[PDB]
């Protein structure tokens, strides 16, 4: 057994790690300048792999989330400080040519403010949102944020459309890709292939509803993290996707007024005509197949005899209540009521929504954004692609299935792009026995 | 406007295929190690940029430090000690890959190190000098 | 000399080469916002030095810098002779003349140098 | 520069021919080549093209699994074959030229995979029709 | 991918500047760094002849009423001093990825 070793090299053995990811390919997503390269990165398939992954420990969620708050607070730094705004604010209603659905929304109120001169004032109106003034104590009303962290305003010259996000991998490193179409987040996957980047990612804000999102392969898929728990939210993704309009139908206008020396504020001019609601619509029948193959998939796995219903939402904040999103650079907040009303045993529809104008963030209450009034009138048509469900409990002998929304945090909405992927360390390095021996 | 002519083996192609066979695609590796490049953004790259320097310079070190520099594979003078695994020599090269082996023997690494080091430094260059003088 | 070969035949100076390879053997030896600028400039040149250093160390030529290999020159990337190559051409000119073929020779240096040369030894090396 | 196209006539269903279309003036074994095709009346439509070292081929959604085009660089000819044919395959056949000269193949260090680049067109000829008839 | 030709076509008279659009359907920004729109004339009983090439770039040989104009949105042209000679079909043509596609028609007149 006479035997000695030898030393390889750049033999392929797999860890793993964590890293710092790399970009790839006015606006303030991404850049103008992030890496230019060649853009087609191609897929490398393998043979006689079987891998083992995991889900919600993604280190890639957490550096997405850091990265976005970081471009996020690199926006609104040079813009203007909006301090001498917290005043008392005499008003009026508004009465000329309105929907008598849209009463008590809109208030004309005026104040006093100096200009760029330290010596004078002036007076200076405008017109607010019912849901961002509130009363002091005619209509003296305070600022909403003026009990609480200071407000700022948004440069003008920025828009906040998303463009899609490749992220790469540094050299010395690796990252995979599940090939099985039929992946529940957690287990092992049995076709891999790696690729030097990722696919097209685009960073889109909304609580409820999934937007502009991915498909998937085969059908309408579940994923959750303990589906025998109560408390895990639940992932869904659809099959076939669902158009919906949403516009604002009133027609805008906009002032801009001194304030400082070398600052200015955007205040809201008149509208011409009448005073609408602004709503959504979508299509009925497309949504009663979508649920029902989501009640076929839903029998899987809990009792298929059981009750499957909706429910309403089980109240709490207004944040998760109604549906952000960013169509045409606002944001919107809509009451969503109507599309979770349904029991189920085994064209048009519309929905009002609200506008907000100081808009919190993510979750942090040290910030406070003023978005100008945007001029003139806003459509925007977008894709449906997946939704966010809840379950109570009380197994009381297995009846009456009630669902609600949810999505609190966004780290959810992406893993729901990134439910594929994984980070791998190379080891180059290695050594095996032989027979042969050195030689003098 | 394109078209594709694949000629040469996968990046990381054969690490399916058993170790005897995929001994032979070493090379490719070695290739792939230093390139990709071929505000904050910029920050991170030169940070992932230093990291593979650094680990580059490692492994080039331990392969310096050993009597096996330079060249690719090559061959020593320790006996095998069968306290390690006990194996009757096919059913590693035709019947094992390489993740496999890793998980065999990712407790006994850095005894074989030290003692590469030992037998590299011990009757080799005290040795050279002995034979360098009559 | 400092690149002194400049305007010279390759045949013509293919002699007093080492000269310049040990005049080219230096670089590091006798030695805030700019900073930044001087971080970088290091970082470029560990870099380029690096790169060369690693393929050189791939193929069998990691010692002298002048060798042999043993792949025949297809007739596919040139087809001039020799002399005329040797005795009428710059190394601007030359390498306008390949710098289209040269990934495909990188690769056949590299399928040469672990193929008949390692496991052929390791062949070799048992008795 | 010349450039015919030449292989008109008529035909019922189910036949084989074999077409030609003569080259001068250009380095021929540089140049891609496609076939373009006009429908009586109506205006244009894509079949097929070859390669520049006559190697790579694609066809149109139609075709795949019926035709057959090959290069003779030797004789500067083209040889195109169209079988089981078709009477609603009745068109203007044309055999023109790209613009642009391609050059060598890129060979990446990443998994090989020689690629390829195309682009428009410059020179059409005057022009043949085949009627497939009954 | 598919291409559209907008608007169909229209007679034209002299003492005119003209403008033919071609509306994309995807942005074809090639990594070599531009944009693959060609556009090439016919004439009735008669073979193709090259307009426009590199997007904005007339070809050799050419008239300079002819250049080209527009970014992966979508495309327009360029003509002025309308002339007799310049009548015929005038196609738009993709030449990014297979199968390639075409530009439908633009019949192309005086005034009667």
């Known amino acids: 057994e006479n035997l000695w070793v030898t030393v390889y090299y750049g033999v392929p053995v797999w860890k793993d790690a964590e890293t710092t990811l790399f970009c790839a390919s006015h606006n303030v997503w991404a850049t103008h300048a992030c890496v230019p390269t060649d853009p087609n990165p191609q897929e490398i398939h393998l043979e006689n792999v079987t891998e083992e992954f995991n889900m919600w420990k993604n280190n890639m969620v957490e550096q997405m989330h850091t990265d976005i708050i970081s471009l996020w607070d690199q926006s609104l730094k040079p813009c203007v400080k909006l301090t001498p705004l917290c005043v008392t604010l005499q008003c009026t209603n508004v009465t000329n040519n309105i929907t008598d659905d849209m009463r008590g929304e809109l208030k004309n109120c005026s104040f006093n403010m100096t200009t760029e001169l330290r010596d004078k004032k002036q007076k200076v109106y405008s017109l607010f949102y019912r849901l961002d003034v509130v009363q002091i104590n005619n209509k003296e009303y305070r600022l909403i944020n003026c009990n609480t962290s200071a407000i700022t305003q948004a440069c003008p010259k920025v828009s906040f459309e998303p463009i899609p996000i490749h992220y790469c991998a540094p050299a010395g490193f690796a990252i995979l890709k599940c090939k099985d179409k039929k992946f529940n987040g957690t287990g092992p996957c049995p076709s891999v292939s790696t690729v030097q980047c990722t696919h097209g990612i685009k960073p889109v804000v909304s609580t409820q509803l999934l937007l502009n999102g991915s498909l998937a392969e085969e059908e309408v898929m579940i994923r959750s993290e303990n589906i025998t728990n109560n408390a895990k939210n639940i992932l869904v993704q659809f099959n076939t996707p669902v158009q919906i309009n949403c516009t604002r139908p009133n027609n805008n206008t906009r002032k801009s007024i001194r304030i400082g020396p070398g600052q200015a504020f955007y205040a809201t001019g008149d509208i011409i005509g009448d005073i609408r609601q602004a709503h959504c619509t979508v299509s009925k029948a497309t949504w009663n197949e979508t649920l029902g193959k989501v009640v076929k998939q839903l029998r899987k796995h809990f009792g298929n005899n059981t009750i499957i219903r909706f429910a309403n939402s089980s109240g709490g904040d207004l944040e998760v209540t109604t549906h952000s999103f960013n169509c045409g650079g606002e944001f919107f907040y809509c009451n969503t009521s109507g599309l979770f009303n349904s029991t189920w045993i085994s064209d048009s529809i519309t929905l009002p929504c609200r506008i907000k104008q100081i808009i919190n963030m993510w979750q942090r209450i040290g910030q406070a954004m003023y978005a100008p009034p945007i001029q003139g009138v806003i459509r925007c048509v977008s894709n449906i692609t997946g939704l966010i469900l809840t379950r109570d409990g009380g197994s009381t002998n297995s009846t009456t299935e009630t669902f609600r929304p949810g999505g609190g945090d966004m780290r959810d909405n992406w893993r729901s792009e990134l439910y594929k992927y994984k980070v791998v360390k190379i080891e180059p390095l290695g050594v095996a026995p032989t027979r042969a021996k050195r030689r003098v | 406007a394109v078209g594709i002519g694949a000629v040469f083996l996968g990046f990381l192609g054969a690490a399916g295929s058993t170790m005897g066979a995929a001994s032979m695609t070493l090379t490719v590796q070695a290739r792939n190690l230093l390139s990709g490049i071929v505000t904050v953004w910029g920050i991170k790259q030169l940070q992932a940029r230093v990291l593979a320097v650094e680990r580059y310079l490692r492994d080039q070190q331990l392969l310096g430090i050993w009597g096996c520099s330079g060249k690719l594979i090559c061959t020593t003078n320790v006996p095998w000690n069968s306290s390690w695994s006990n194996r009757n020599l096919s059913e590693i090269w035709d019947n094992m890959t390489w993740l496999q082996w890793d998980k065999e023997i990712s407790n006994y690494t850095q005894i074989i190190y030290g003692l590469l080091e030992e037998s590299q430094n011990q009757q080799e260059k005290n040795e050279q000098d002995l034979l360098a003088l009559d | 000399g400092f690149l002194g070969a400049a305007g010279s035949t390759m045949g013509a100076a293919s002699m007093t080469l080492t000269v310049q390879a040990r005049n080219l053997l230096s670089g590091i030896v006798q030695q805030t916002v700019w900073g930044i600028k001087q971080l970088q400039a290091r970082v470029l040149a560990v870099e380029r030095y690096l790169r060369d250093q690693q393929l050189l160390g791939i193929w069998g030529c990691s010692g002298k810098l002048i060798c042999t290999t043993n792949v025949p020159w297809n007739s596919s990337w040139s087809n001039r002779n020799l002399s005329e190559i040797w005795d009428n051409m710059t190394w601007l000119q030359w390498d306008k003349e390949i710098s289209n073929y040269t990934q495909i020779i990188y690769g056949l240096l590299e399928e040469s140098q672990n193929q008949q040369e390692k496991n052929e030894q390791d062949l070799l090396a048992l008795d | 520069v010349q450039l015919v196209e030449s292989g008109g006539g008529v035909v019922q269903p189910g036949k084989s021919v074999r077409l030609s279309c003569v080259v001068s003036?250009?380095?021929?074994?540089?140049?891609?080549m496609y076939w373009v095709r006009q429908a009586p009346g109506k205006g244009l439509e894509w079949v097929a093209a070859?390669?520049?070292?006559?190697?790579?081929?694609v066809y149109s959604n139609s075709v795949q699994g019926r035709f057959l085009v090959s290069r003779d660089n030797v004789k500067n000819t083209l040889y195109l074959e169209m079988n089981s044919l078709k009477i609603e395959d009745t068109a203007v056949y044309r055999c023109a030229r790209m613009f642009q000269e391609s050059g060598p193949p890129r060979l990446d260090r990443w998994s090989g995979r020689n690629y390829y680049y195309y682009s428009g067109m410059d020179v059409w000829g005057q022009g043949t029709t085949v009627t497939v008839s009954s | 991918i598919v291409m559209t030709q907008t608007p169909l076509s229209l007679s034209v008279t002299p003492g005119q500047p003209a403008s033919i659009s071609c509306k994309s359907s995807?942005?074809?920004?090639?990594?070599?760094?531009?944009?693959?729109l060609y556009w090439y004339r016919q004439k009735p009983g008669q073979s193709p002849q090259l307009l426009v090439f590199?997007?904005?770039n007339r070809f050799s040989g050419v008239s300079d009423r002819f250049v080209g104009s527009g970014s992966g949105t979508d495309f327009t042209l360029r003509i002025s001093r309308v002339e007799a000679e310049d009548v015929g079909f005038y196609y738009c043509?993709?030449?990014?990825?297979?199968?390639?596609?075409f530009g439908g028609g633009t019949k192309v007149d005086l005034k009667r």
């Open positions: 043509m993709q030449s990014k990825d297979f199968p390639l596609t």
């Open positions: 070859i390669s520049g070292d006559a190697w790579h081929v």
């Open positions: 003036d250009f380095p021929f074994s540089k140049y891609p």
């Open positions: 590199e997007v904005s």
């Open positions: 995807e942005s074809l920004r090639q990594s070599n760094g531009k944009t693959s």
